[PDB]
């Protein structure tokens, strides 16, 4: 039969097969369920979509058409939940907030 | 020259679907590859720990959902749980 990707089966852009292979080779459990790579690929896709959309909005407000680590740093540090998720993370060439009051 | 295997093309499809005209630099792609890898190790480690605590030998979507609820703060967890449940439901129906 014609081969169909599990990413296309799940309606995702992230690789369900590669996430499955990294879950098997990553020494996390003896077995990996079928829906676990689908769930992980969906969660990773949602997180990259949210950070990329906020960084694209920051780049649009900075009148630029390219996302740089400064735009990524602005997008993450201007958000409570993203800053709680990535509090102990240094973004190279990210800078700091302009601390405008 | 030995198949470095990044997430760059998938981050590109996601970027072109949420912002069809903006681009991204190679530095920002490296940042975002590191982000995807870091979140992968966090969620997989929490799910592995949950499966070890409950004396299971398999990691399932229940373990992934509980790891997401433990690690992501606030409405991020709710929206990621919705996205994962939607993708698993779409995958099961094929």
């Amino acid at each position: 039969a014609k081969a169909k990707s599990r990413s296309s089966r799940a309606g995702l852009q992230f690789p369900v097969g590669r996430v499955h292979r990294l879950l098997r080779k990553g020494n996390y459990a003896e077995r990996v369920g079928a829906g676990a790579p689908v769930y992980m690929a969906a969660v990773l896709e949602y997180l990259t979509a949210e950070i990329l959309e906020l960084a694209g909005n920051a780049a649009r407000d900075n009148k630029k058409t390219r996302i740089i680590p400064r735009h990524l740093q602005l997008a993450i540090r201007n958000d409570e939940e993203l800053n709680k998720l990535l509090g102990k993370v240094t973004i190279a060439q990210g800078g700091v907030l302009p601390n405008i009051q | 020259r030995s198949r470095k295997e990044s997430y760059s093309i998938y981050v590109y499809k996601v970027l072109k679907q949420v912002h069809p005209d903006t681009g991204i630099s190679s530095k920002a792609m490296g940042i975002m590859n590191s982000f995807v890898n870091d979140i992968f190790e966090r969620i997989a480690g929490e799910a592995s720990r949950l499966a070890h605590y409950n004396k299971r030998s398999t990691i399932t979507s229940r373990e992934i959902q509980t790891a997401v609820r433990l690690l992501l703060p606030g409405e991020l967890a709710k929206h990621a749980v919705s996205e994962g449940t939607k993708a698993v439901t779409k995958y099961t129906s094929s």
Partner: single-chain antibody
Amino acid sequence: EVQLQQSGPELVEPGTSVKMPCKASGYTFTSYTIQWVKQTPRQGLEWIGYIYPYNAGTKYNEKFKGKATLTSDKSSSTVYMELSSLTSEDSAVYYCARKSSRLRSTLDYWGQGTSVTVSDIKMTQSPSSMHASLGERVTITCKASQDIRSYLSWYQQKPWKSPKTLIYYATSLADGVPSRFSGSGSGQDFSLTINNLESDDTATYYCLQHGESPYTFGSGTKLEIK
């Protein structure tokens, strides 16, 4: 659990300034933006602006800059809004609503409304007023002007009550809303469907986009039962 307390009605003479609170409780106050919505009988719901109490960040509507000024007080978990130089066309009820910083989220919880009286994307709702019995299927169309990437919400407002969120992200059910309600559509075409009617469903239904920077509501659709 989540409550957004406001003040009473302000009988205010023209030319002065008015400030009203939006004291919030039941949730982590800095993690959610507080958005302000005005309501007039003449042109319906209108989005004014918001304050993000995490960094005191604001964004206003184009036509409310100078007319509106938003402030946050982190100590008492209270959001204040300043209206200055009150023109005769400012007699309205002002709602404050909670919206998360996520782009997918919407105004899920609202305040009761402060009636102050003085002494771009256009969203078209195809039905203006519909009538139904207690058991049929009724649909509501929310034809959009520009492309929005499924960033559309549906609200139900009883007469003289705060609006209640039904659908967010154009398909997802809100918290506590039953499976009877169902939303569909993406891009520019959107639809809200009610499975069967009850006497509770007699209300006015609005659709709100939050894709671009000025948030715009729909015209409104009155549903009458039997």
